[PDB]
Protein backbone atom coordinates (compact mmCIF):
# COMPACT_ATOMS: atom_id res chain seq x y z
CA UNK A 1 0.00 0.00 0.00
CA UNK A 2 2.96 2.37 0.46
CA UNK A 3 4.80 1.31 -2.73
CA UNK A 4 2.17 2.02 -5.39
CA UNK A 5 2.79 2.19 -9.13
CA UNK A 6 1.85 5.34 -11.06
CA UNK A 7 1.02 4.72 -14.72
CA UNK A 8 1.14 7.71 -17.07
CA UNK A 9 -1.43 7.59 -19.88
CA UNK A 10 -0.96 9.45 -23.18
CA UNK A 11 -3.22 10.64 -25.99
CA UNK A 12 -5.81 7.89 -26.46
CA UNK A 13 -9.54 7.15 -26.11
CA UNK A 14 -10.50 5.54 -22.79
CA UNK A 15 -13.67 3.44 -22.52
CA UNK A 16 -14.91 3.63 -18.93
CA UNK A 17 -17.32 0.72 -19.42
CA UNK A 18 -15.21 -2.43 -18.87
CA UNK A 19 -14.67 -1.41 -15.24
CA UNK A 20 -17.95 -3.10 -14.23
CA UNK A 21 -17.33 -6.37 -16.10
CA UNK A 22 -15.27 -8.11 -13.40
CA UNK A 23 -16.57 -10.18 -10.48
CA UNK A 24 -19.47 -8.69 -8.46
CA UNK A 25 -19.27 -6.98 -5.05
CA UNK A 26 -17.21 -3.98 -6.15
CA UNK A 27 -17.57 -0.31 -5.26
CA UNK A 28 -17.71 2.56 -7.75
CA UNK A 29 -17.71 5.61 -5.48
CA UNK A 30 -16.60 8.78 -7.28
CA UNK A 31 -15.42 12.15 -5.98
CA UNK A 32 -16.24 15.35 -7.86
CA UNK A 33 -17.34 13.42 -10.98
CA UNK A 34 -20.08 10.98 -11.99
CA UNK A 35 -19.90 7.72 -13.97
CA UNK A 36 -22.68 8.70 -16.39
CA UNK A 37 -21.06 12.08 -17.13
CA UNK A 38 -17.48 10.76 -16.92
CA UNK A 39 -17.16 10.75 -20.72
CA UNK A 40 -18.05 14.43 -21.15
CA UNK A 41 -15.10 16.26 -19.59
CA UNK A 42 -11.66 16.29 -21.22
CA UNK A 43 -8.61 15.40 -19.12
CA UNK A 44 -4.91 15.64 -19.97
CA UNK A 45 -3.31 12.90 -17.85
CA UNK A 46 -4.91 10.14 -15.77
CA UNK A 47 -2.75 8.42 -13.15
CA UNK A 48 -3.63 5.03 -11.64
CA UNK A 49 -2.29 4.16 -8.17
CA UNK A 50 -2.72 0.47 -7.34
Amino acid at each position, epitope marked *: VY*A*W*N*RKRISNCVADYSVLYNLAPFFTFKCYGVSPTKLNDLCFTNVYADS
Partner: antibody
Amino acid sequence: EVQLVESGGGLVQPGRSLRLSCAASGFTFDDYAIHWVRQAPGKGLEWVSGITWNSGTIGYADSVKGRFTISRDNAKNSLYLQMNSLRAEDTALYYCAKHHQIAVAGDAEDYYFDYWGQGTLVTVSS
Amino acid sequence: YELTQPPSVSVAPGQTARITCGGNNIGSKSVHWYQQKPGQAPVLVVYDDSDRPSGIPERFSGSNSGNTATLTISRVEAGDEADYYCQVWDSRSDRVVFGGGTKLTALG
Protein backbone atom coordinates in the same frame (compact mmCIF):
# COMPACT_ATOMS: atom_id res chain seq x y z
CA GLU B 1 23.01 -1.85 -24.71
CA VAL B 2 21.65 -3.06 -21.37
CA GLN B 3 23.61 -1.64 -18.42
CA LEU B 4 22.30 -2.92 -15.07
CA VAL B 5 24.53 -1.02 -12.65
CA GLU B 6 24.51 -2.75 -9.25
CA SER B 7 25.54 -0.82 -6.13
CA GLY B 8 25.69 -1.65 -2.44
CA GLY B 9 27.83 -4.27 -0.74
CA GLY B 10 30.62 -4.75 1.77
CA LEU B 11 31.57 -6.12 5.17
CA VAL B 12 28.81 -5.76 7.77
CA GLN B 13 28.34 -7.21 11.24
CA PRO B 14 25.82 -10.06 11.70
CA GLY B 15 22.45 -8.54 12.57
CA ARG B 16 22.72 -5.20 10.75
CA SER B 17 20.84 -3.94 7.68
CA LEU B 18 21.84 -2.66 4.25
CA ARG B 19 20.38 -1.47 0.95
CA LEU B 20 21.33 -2.77 -2.50
CA SER B 21 20.35 -0.94 -5.68
CA CYS B 22 20.08 -1.96 -9.34
CA ALA B 23 19.71 0.79 -11.94
CA ALA B 24 18.72 0.06 -15.53
CA SER B 25 20.00 1.83 -18.64
CA GLY B 26 19.17 1.14 -22.28
CA PHE B 27 15.54 0.00 -22.15
CA THR B 28 12.24 1.28 -20.76
CA PHE B 29 11.73 0.58 -17.04
CA ASP B 30 7.97 0.08 -17.39
CA ASP B 31 7.51 -3.23 -19.27
CA TYR B 32 10.14 -5.64 -17.89
CA ALA B 33 10.50 -7.71 -14.73
CA ILE B 34 13.71 -7.66 -12.69
CA HIS B 35 14.80 -10.19 -10.06
CA TRP B 36 17.51 -10.47 -7.43
CA VAL B 37 19.16 -13.90 -7.32
CA ARG B 38 22.23 -14.65 -5.21
CA GLN B 39 25.02 -17.05 -6.14
CA ALA B 40 27.16 -18.79 -3.54
CA PRO B 41 30.84 -19.19 -4.54
CA GLY B 42 31.13 -22.58 -6.22
CA LYS B 43 27.82 -23.76 -4.73
CA GLY B 44 25.27 -22.89 -7.41
CA LEU B 45 22.76 -20.05 -7.44
CA GLU B 46 19.70 -19.24 -5.33
CA TRP B 47 16.78 -17.01 -6.26
CA VAL B 48 16.07 -14.31 -3.67
CA SER B 49 13.16 -12.22 -4.95
CA GLY B 50 11.80 -10.31 -7.93
CA ILE B 51 9.39 -7.64 -9.11
CA THR B 52 7.32 -7.56 -12.30
CA TRP B 53 7.07 -4.65 -14.76
CA ASN B 54 4.79 -2.75 -12.38
CA SER B 55 5.08 -2.33 -8.61
CA GLY B 56 4.38 -5.94 -7.66
CA THR B 57 6.07 -8.57 -5.52
CA ILE B 58 6.21 -12.11 -6.91
CA GLY B 59 7.36 -13.95 -3.77
CA TYR B 60 10.40 -15.11 -1.84
CA ALA B 61 12.23 -18.29 -0.83
CA ASP B 62 11.65 -20.48 2.25
CA SER B 63 14.48 -18.87 4.25
CA VAL B 64 14.33 -15.15 3.34
CA LYS B 65 10.75 -14.29 4.31
CA GLY B 66 10.35 -11.43 6.77
CA ARG B 67 13.99 -10.29 6.53
CA PHE B 68 14.26 -8.89 2.98
CA THR B 69 12.11 -6.22 1.36
CA ILE B 70 12.22 -5.50 -2.38
CA SER B 71 10.89 -2.28 -3.92
CA ARG B 72 10.67 -0.66 -7.35
CA ASP B 73 11.00 2.96 -8.47
CA ASN B 74 9.73 3.84 -11.95
CA ALA B 75 10.44 7.54 -11.37
CA LYS B 76 14.16 6.87 -10.80
CA ASN B 77 14.13 3.54 -12.70
CA SER B 78 15.77 1.46 -9.98
CA LEU B 79 15.08 -1.74 -8.04
CA TYR B 80 16.05 -1.57 -4.36
CA LEU B 81 16.47 -4.38 -1.84
CA GLN B 82 16.63 -3.80 1.93
CA MET B 83 18.22 -6.64 3.90
CA ASN B 84 17.79 -6.95 7.67
CA SER B 85 19.07 -9.48 10.23
CA LEU B 86 21.90 -10.88 8.12
CA ARG B 87 23.51 -14.14 9.23
CA ALA B 88 26.56 -16.18 8.26
CA GLU B 89 24.69 -18.03 5.48
CA ASP B 90 23.99 -14.84 3.48
CA THR B 91 27.43 -14.46 1.83
CA ALA B 92 26.86 -14.69 -1.92
CA LEU B 93 27.00 -12.67 -5.14
CA TYR B 94 23.59 -11.01 -5.49
CA TYR B 95 22.89 -10.73 -9.23
CA CYS B 96 20.29 -8.42 -10.78
CA ALA B 97 18.68 -10.21 -13.72
CA LYS B 98 16.12 -8.88 -16.19
CA HIS B 99 13.22 -10.60 -17.98
CA HIS B 100 12.81 -11.33 -21.68
CA GLN B 101 9.04 -11.23 -22.16
CA ILE B 102 7.07 -7.98 -21.94
CA ALA B 103 4.74 -9.52 -19.30
CA VAL B 104 1.40 -8.87 -21.00
CA ALA B 105 -1.74 -8.66 -18.87
CA GLY B 106 -3.40 -11.98 -19.71
CA ASP B 107 -0.82 -14.78 -19.84
CA ALA B 108 0.66 -17.56 -17.71
CA GLU B 109 3.03 -17.07 -14.78
CA ASP B 110 6.40 -17.94 -16.34
CA TYR B 111 9.37 -15.63 -15.69
CA TYR B 112 12.87 -16.37 -16.96
CA PHE B 113 16.05 -14.30 -17.01
CA ASP B 114 17.45 -12.75 -20.18
CA TYR B 115 20.24 -10.36 -19.09
CA TRP B 116 22.72 -10.75 -16.24
CA GLY B 117 24.99 -8.37 -14.35
CA GLN B 118 28.20 -8.50 -12.32
CA GLY B 119 27.03 -8.84 -8.71
CA THR B 120 28.27 -7.30 -5.47
CA LEU B 121 30.17 -9.26 -2.82
CA VAL B 122 28.08 -8.85 0.35
CA THR B 123 29.97 -10.66 3.12
CA VAL B 124 28.59 -11.00 6.65
CA SER B 125 31.11 -11.83 9.39
CA SER B 126 32.60 -10.50 12.62
CA TYR C 1 10.08 -28.10 -5.87
CA GLU C 2 13.37 -30.00 -6.06
CA LEU C 3 15.37 -30.70 -9.22
CA THR C 4 17.95 -33.49 -9.50
CA GLN C 5 21.01 -32.82 -11.66
CA PRO C 6 24.15 -34.89 -12.29
CA PRO C 7 27.19 -33.71 -10.31
CA SER C 8 29.59 -33.74 -13.28
CA VAL C 9 29.32 -35.01 -16.86
CA SER C 10 32.44 -35.32 -19.02
CA VAL C 11 32.49 -36.24 -22.71
CA ALA C 12 35.07 -36.19 -25.49
CA PRO C 13 34.70 -33.40 -28.11
CA GLY C 14 33.52 -35.85 -30.77
CA GLN C 15 29.93 -36.55 -29.75
CA THR C 16 27.09 -34.92 -27.81
CA ALA C 17 26.56 -34.79 -24.05
CA ARG C 18 23.56 -35.56 -21.84
CA ILE C 19 22.52 -32.90 -19.30
CA THR C 20 19.22 -33.97 -17.73
CA CYS C 21 16.96 -32.22 -15.22
CA GLY C 22 14.00 -34.14 -13.82
CA GLY C 23 11.45 -33.78 -11.07
CA ASN C 24 8.25 -35.42 -9.80
CA ASN C 25 5.46 -34.38 -12.20
CA ILE C 26 7.19 -31.82 -14.46
CA GLY C 27 5.61 -32.60 -17.82
CA SER C 28 3.84 -29.42 -18.91
CA LYS C 29 5.45 -26.49 -17.08
CA SER C 30 8.08 -24.48 -18.93
CA VAL C 31 11.76 -25.36 -18.47
CA HIS C 32 14.50 -22.80 -19.15
CA TRP C 33 18.28 -23.15 -19.32
CA TYR C 34 21.26 -20.90 -18.64
CA GLN C 35 25.01 -21.18 -19.25
CA GLN C 36 27.36 -19.39 -16.84
CA LYS C 37 31.06 -19.26 -17.66
CA PRO C 38 33.44 -19.40 -14.67
CA GLY C 39 34.23 -15.78 -13.81
CA GLN C 40 32.06 -14.16 -16.49
CA ALA C 41 28.31 -13.40 -16.54
CA PRO C 42 25.66 -16.02 -17.33
CA VAL C 43 24.02 -16.14 -20.75
CA LEU C 44 20.72 -17.48 -22.08
CA VAL C 45 20.57 -20.65 -24.18
CA VAL C 46 17.74 -22.66 -25.76
CA TYR C 47 14.74 -22.37 -23.43
CA ASP C 48 11.23 -23.88 -23.42
CA ASP C 49 12.61 -26.67 -25.68
CA SER C 50 10.97 -24.93 -28.66
CA ASP C 51 12.96 -21.74 -29.36
CA ARG C 52 16.40 -20.18 -28.94
CA PRO C 53 17.49 -16.60 -28.16
CA SER C 54 19.25 -14.32 -30.64
CA GLY C 55 22.89 -15.39 -31.09
CA ILE C 56 22.68 -19.00 -29.89
CA PRO C 57 23.64 -21.34 -32.78
CA GLU C 58 21.78 -24.51 -33.77
CA ARG C 59 24.22 -26.58 -31.68
CA PHE C 60 22.11 -26.11 -28.53
CA SER C 61 18.71 -27.78 -28.22
CA GLY C 62 16.27 -28.89 -25.56
CA SER C 63 13.85 -31.79 -25.34
CA ASN C 64 11.23 -32.63 -22.71
CA SER C 65 9.61 -36.08 -22.52
CA GLY C 66 7.37 -36.83 -19.55
CA ASN C 67 9.61 -36.10 -16.56
CA THR C 68 13.07 -35.35 -18.00
CA ALA C 69 14.38 -32.21 -19.70
CA THR C 70 17.55 -32.89 -21.71
CA LEU C 71 19.87 -30.16 -23.00
CA THR C 72 21.66 -31.49 -26.08
CA ILE C 73 24.84 -29.68 -27.17
CA SER C 74 26.09 -30.49 -30.67
CA ARG C 75 29.81 -30.51 -31.53
CA VAL C 76 31.10 -29.63 -28.07
CA GLU C 77 34.42 -27.77 -28.13
CA ALA C 78 36.95 -26.54 -25.58
CA GLY C 79 35.32 -23.10 -25.34
CA ASP C 80 31.98 -24.63 -24.30
CA GLU C 81 33.10 -25.73 -20.82
CA ALA C 82 30.80 -23.85 -18.44
CA ASP C 83 28.15 -24.37 -15.76
CA TYR C 84 24.72 -25.31 -17.12
CA TYR C 85 21.68 -24.55 -14.95
CA CYS C 86 18.04 -25.53 -15.46
CA GLN C 87 15.23 -23.32 -14.16
CA VAL C 88 11.57 -24.16 -13.50
CA TRP C 89 8.72 -21.99 -12.27
CA ASP C 90 6.74 -24.27 -9.89
CA SER C 91 3.67 -22.06 -9.54
CA ARG C 92 2.50 -24.25 -6.63
CA SER C 93 4.96 -22.52 -4.27
CA ASP C 94 5.42 -19.15 -6.07
CA ARG C 95 9.21 -19.52 -6.16
CA VAL C 96 12.12 -20.03 -8.58
CA VAL C 97 13.68 -23.42 -7.83
CA PHE C 98 17.28 -23.72 -9.03
CA GLY C 99 19.64 -26.68 -8.67
CA GLY C 100 23.24 -27.77 -8.57
CA GLY C 101 24.63 -27.14 -12.03
CA THR C 102 26.73 -29.63 -13.97
CA LYS C 103 30.34 -28.76 -14.84
CA LEU C 104 30.70 -29.90 -18.44
CA THR C 105 34.39 -30.65 -19.08
CA ALA C 106 35.58 -31.74 -22.53
CA LEU C 107 37.78 -34.75 -21.78
CA GLY C 108 40.74 -35.38 -24.06
